[PDB]
Design a protein around this ligand. Structure first.
Ligand SMILES: [Cl-]
Ligand SMILES: [Cl-]
Ligand SMILES: [Cl-]
Ligand SMILES: [Cl-]
Ligand SMILES: [Cl-]
Lengths: 87, 13
């Protein structure tokens, strides 16, 4: 199934910086564009690519952390949900 | 592993 979401302003800015062109998204779309953003800006550690450094990026201002691990599935979703409204 | 595959594993719950 799908869950529809409306990003808050900073998330919306990020999404649009990587090609997104709308106000309402599916969660699958949000997660795609965030992955695209991180990959495009090479925010991850070159050697241990589960580690994302974002203290000097907009993503750090969005998530409110200097870094995180891609393996923290719960915390990533929590940090994304804080920046959107469901439906 | 590549960031690409790790994030896909994330998306692919
Ligand atoms: Cl969805
Ligand atoms: Cl905001
Ligand atoms: Cl930035
Ligand atoms: Cl977690
Ligand atoms: Cl909500």
């Amino acid at each position: 199934q799908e869950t529809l979401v409306r990003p808050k302003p900073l998330l919306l800015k990020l999404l649009k910086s990587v090609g997104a062109q709308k106000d309402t998204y599916t969660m699958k779309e949000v997660l795609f564009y965030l992955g695209q953003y991180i990959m495009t800006k090479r925010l991850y550690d070159e050697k241990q690519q589960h580690i994302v450094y974002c203290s000097n990026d907009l993503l750090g201002d969005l998530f409110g952390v200097p870094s995180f691990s891609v393996k923290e599935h719960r915390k990533i979703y929590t940090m994304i949900y804080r920046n959107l409204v469901v439906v | 592993q590549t960031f690409x595959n790790l994030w896909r594993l994330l998306l692919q719950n």
